[PDB]
Amino acid sequence: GSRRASVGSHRFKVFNYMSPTFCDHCGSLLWGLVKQGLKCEDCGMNVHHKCREKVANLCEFIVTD
């Protein structure tokens, strides 16, 4: 048997973090109070703008529906 996964590539979009949040790639704070980084619309990964270029494109998550 198998889980069902949604498999694609990340879809990053600038996001307004309402509390201090860290880059899921590098571990440093997403600096500032607005538009601090990007959140993947599909899997929720948070990255610095600069880290968008560093992450693997692979985007998967378990579909728990």
The two tokens of residue 25 are: 């790639």
Residue 42 found at the interface with a second copy (CB under 8 A):
yes
Residue 22 found at the interface with Zn ion (CB under 5 A):
no
Residue 37 has φ and ψ, to the nearest 5°, of: -175, -160
Residue 25 contact partner, candidates a second copy, Zn ion, none, CB within 5 to 8 A by sort of partner: Zn ion
Compare residues 23 and 38 and give the one whose CB is closer to Zn ion: 23
Residue 64 found at the interface with a second copy (CB under 8 A):
no
The site for a second copy (CB under 8 A) is made up of 1-9, 42, 57, 59, 63
